[PDB]
Subunit: 222 residues, 3 copies
């Protein structure tokens, strides 16, 4: 459309759609209950992202936020996506290593706090306070990354695949607060069309790339 | 009130209230943990619907959506209801057959996608796009119905009761996308007062009728 | 600020922040899975409350509701807090006594209904109807309190600690509907600044006070 970022929302929509259908077909036939869990979780993630990319593409998931005395285009639908998809991604990791339930609840809840405070930050009209929310969200993120690294006799296959996905997760997720900070939600140093591209690349990598690694491994089978 | 559909919202409120109190009294005394689960799930469903029917009745759960250059009355509270009640209904089925957790997560998540995209569709102001959301929601519904039919040594009692509730579920749930399509959210072929009646009959049947079948069966006891 | 209630939102923010960091440090080193659960649940509760107290403090979690022909300041962020923190508090109790899953689902769902109907009540513009929602919410609360008292061979340590926390819970939670009723959401007999103080004292007691009791007990360890 007239939104220069449309192309990246259209490509992200397509790529998440295609990944969803690929993982859907792929899990057909799986009967191993353990594998079934990883397929469900991992197919749902880009399915949800598909819908929220489409909602941005069609303009539904966009709102205007006044701050710095301008009308700032804020794509709120990203936060509806991440609210569900990031705990699911963490559940994939958590099930892989057979985490304690207390650790899973710590992780999902810290994640909720991460996304929810990112959303408040995204919609806050007092510019300096936006970054207070950014910082609290970032602290939740660092708690999560901490736990993925220092809170965890897995069969070697589990350990191997977990170590790869953990490294994928730390590197990609750590980029999100930077993109937000430099983009239109934060300091406005990078234009929205380039921010939207950055988040498209991260999201497809963190969802479809991550799931391709995971669903290809024997680590998911009993 | 001045809303011709008020009578059907009032009757639905009453019928969901009465079913809630009936199942509440009925489960008094149940000590079998397995039965306790089916009572909790099944009592909660019309309790939630009661509150959302009342919110429509009092006017809180109604908003105006501009599309086709008119101010279209959209009852959004139905989606808050269904967001919680339809996965609970699926959990009842899922527990009955002792489904794998991966299958339960596939089902709840597809359901979330179904209702959430129905909600986006209901609130979308570009008329043609409303039906894009309808179609995606319908595809999620067909996934769910698929799984209820082709994804599942139950004691005979389980199998019998499941087969009945599964048939109830496919027939009633499949009617919802049609009512939406022909009613005020979609093509506007049927007036809101008749749509509201249709959804009242479906909802009471899918909640109170379904639970009467289920809670009467010995299938719910260990 | 210019909001006389700011001091109590600032103190509540600080006290919930400090309790969160205290329980965080405290649970460092716990390896007992059972204890890990109670720490996660119990650290998350004031963490969430911290964010929602800060959102009120900064003005984000405040909206104006027209009712009685005035513009009534309503802090909606309390309901986002409680929506998550009150079922977590109930989960702490429920895990302590090893409740049946059916009882946990009854409790979380009644709780959802309690907070959600409180929220509708808080945002309803027809003044008399506000108290219809109050009453339904209160009925959900009384169901919960009922179950905490009459629905439950625990090791003596469990029983002791549960009896204390149950008594803490009944007394503090029962005060919330009264504060709402007499305060700015309800009859307007007590000013918002005094209401905000009352809820600050209850919240800190029900979260940080409750968790101090719980996390100090050996009841949380296998
Ligand atoms: C858990 C565990 C931990 C809890 C986390 C603690 C922090 C909780 C914060 C949350 C608060 C939510 C804020 C939001 C609902 C308030 C909306 O008001 C906006 C600000 O004026 C108005 O913007 C105008 C438009 C805005 C758009 C917001 C919409 C978003 C919706 C995403 C939700 C998704 C759920 C799918 C539902 C179907
Ligand atoms: C920070 C604590 C440790 C965490 C506690 C939460 C507090 C967050 C506050 C950090 C800091 C004040 C933010 C203040 C930004 C300030 C320079 C705004 C500039 O002033 C201009 C006119 O007043 C704003 O117009 C517009 C000018 C803009 C283009 C300037 C953008 C501001 C940027 C802020 C960057 C935050 C990162 C430095 C934090 C990295 C650590
Ligand atoms: C570090 C830790 C918390 C930092 C406390 C600081 C205290 C700030 O005092 C005043 C500075 O003028 C803020 O009030 C000035 C008026 C405004 C009020 C702002 C106070 C809040 C923005 C700070 C609330 C605590 C912060 C939490 C930082 C997040 C943490 C998780 C990294
Ligand atoms: C976004 C990209 C980085 C852009 C730059 C492209 C260069 C790629 C560098 C990423 C890094 C790759 C990490 C490799 C890993 C392999 C190590 O595994 C170890 C074996 O046990 C795990 O131990 C311990 C594990 C340790 C591994 C921690 C990974 C680091 C995380 C980096 C933070 C992020 C980057 C911040 C984004 C930046 C763009 C602002
Ligand atoms: C899971 C697993 C899968 C996730 C599903 C993927 C699709 C996610 C989509 C969701 C997005 C939610 C949209 C909505 C929050 C945005 C509201 O903005 C509207 C559109 O301009 C404004 O309408 C004005 C009024 C509107 C009314 C909307 C209110 C509704 C609230 C229902 C929520 C309930 C929760 C009970 C809370 C107490
Ligand atoms: C369809 C794909 C397979 C799924 C992918 C999602 C795309 C959904 C698009 C389907 C289709 C275009 C919808 C277009 C409706 C079109 C006739 C609108 C009529 O034009 C009028 C003026 O432009 C609209 O005013 C008002 C006129 C209205 C009274 C007309 C109502 C439109 C109706 C659409 C009915 C949809 C069902 C046919 C789909 C059953 C399959
Ligand atoms: C809404 C009503 C239908 C309105 C019409 C009233 C006539 C009633 C027909 C409903 C049908 C009844 C199904 C009976 C079932 C019994 C079969 O059980 C089988 C034994 O294993 C299950 O195998 C395989 C099971 C097979 C059963 C699948 C059921 C079919 C589902 C029909 C879709 C819905 C109807 C679409 C709504 C329409 C009004 C637009
Ligand atoms: C379960 C089990 C049981 C389900 C309970 C049954 C009752 C369900 C009722 C729910 C309905 C939610 C109502 C609300 C979303 C509608 C908002 O419209 C308001 C009224 O005109 C507009 O106020 C303008 C502003 C308002 C502010 C409302 C925001 C609040 C957000 C809190 C949600 C939190 C989730 C954190 C998300 C990030
Ligand atoms: C009650 C049933 C058992 C439960 C079913 C739900 C129905 C709730 C209705 C209870 C009752 C009507 C509420 C009616 C309040 C009425 C006195 C309002 C006073 O009239 C004034 C002008 O019309 C309102 O202006 C403003 C005047 C205000 C300052 C008056 C505040 C009203 C107060 C209502 C108090 C409710 C508690 C008594 C309920 C305790 C039990
Ligand atoms: C006691 C039980 C339910 C009470 C039913 C009463 C019936 C009220 O009849 C009319 C009185 O004029 C209300 O319609 C007058 C127009 C308005 C409609 C209001 C009707 C609803 C406010 C009542 C819906 C049922 C109530 C539920 C009370 C909550 C219960 C859980 C304690
Ligand atoms: C908010 C405060 C009360 C303000 C007044 C300060 C005085 C403190 C009184 C609170 C009470 C203390 C309860 C002690 C308990 C100890 C009993 O344990 C028993 C041993 O099995 C449990 O059996 C059976 C357990 C029984 C215990 C039930 C507790 C009662 C609950 C009271 C309802 C609340 C108060 C309503 C608030 C008011 C301020 C409107
Ligand atoms: C059969 C497998 C390999 C997957 C094909 C399904 C299609 C959709 C997603 C697949 C590609 C993603 C690889 C993961 C990592 C990346 C960093 C993706 C970032 C996107 C950038 C654009 C590059 C081209 C693509 C169209 C694949
Ligand atoms: C004791 C049992 C039978 C239930 C009585 C509790 C009352 C409320 C619901 C009970 C009736 C519902 C039967 C399920 C199926 C139906 C298709 C219901 C659709 C509603 C249509 C109106 C018919 C009359 C009613 C008032 C029951
Ligand atoms: C190490 C322990 C004791 C806790 C210290 C962490 C700090 C924050 C919360 C601790 C205090 C709360 C006690 C629970 C009960 C109360 C009724 C709290 C209500 C608050 C009223 C203000 C009183 C002073 C306070 C600043 C503690
Ligand atoms: C599917 C997409 C994923 C994996 C997205 C991850 C998003 C985050 C890790 C976001 C983090 C943020 C912060 C740490 C700071 C505030 C802004 C956020 C929400 C972008
Ligand atoms: C308690 C009520 C129940 C069982 C409601 C079920 C609702 C659905 C199956 C709704 C389905 C829809 C679609 C498939 C298409 C878009 C519109 C919906 C949300 C009405
Ligand atoms: C962390 C805070 C807690 C424990 C808050 C508890 C809140 C309640 C028990 C609220 C109850 C309410 C009703 C029973 C009636 C309507 C108003 C409410 C939501 C304040």
């Amino acid at each position: 459309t007239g939104r220069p970022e449309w192309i990246w929302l259209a490509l992200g929509t397509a790529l998440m759609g295609l990944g969803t259908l690929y993982f859907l077909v792929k899990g057909m036939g799986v009967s191993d209950p353990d594998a079934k869990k990883f397929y469900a979780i991992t197919t749902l993630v880009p399915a949800i992202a598909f819908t929220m990319y489409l909602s941005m593409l069609l303009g539904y998931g966009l709102t205007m936020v006044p701050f710095g005395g301008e009308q700032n285009p804020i794509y709120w639908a990203r936060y509806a996506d991440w609210l569900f998809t990031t705990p699911l991604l963490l559940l994939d990791l958590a099930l892989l290593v057979d985490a304690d339930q207390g650790t899973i609840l710590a992780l999902v809840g810290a994640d909720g706090i991460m996304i929810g405070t990112g959303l408040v930050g995204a919609l806050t009209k007092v510019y300096s306070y936006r970054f207070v929310w950014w910082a609290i969200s970032t602290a939740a993120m660092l708690y999560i990354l901490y736990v993925l690294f220092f809170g965890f006799s897995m069969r070697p296959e589990v350990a191997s695949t977990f170590k790869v996905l953990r490294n994928v997760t730390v590197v990609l997720w750590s980029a999100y607060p930077v993109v937000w900070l430099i983009g239109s939600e934060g300091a406005g140093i990078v234009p929205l069309n380039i921010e939207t591209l950055l988040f498209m690349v991260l999201d497809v990598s963190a969802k479809v790339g991550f799931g391709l690694i995971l669903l290809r491994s024997r680590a998911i089978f009993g």
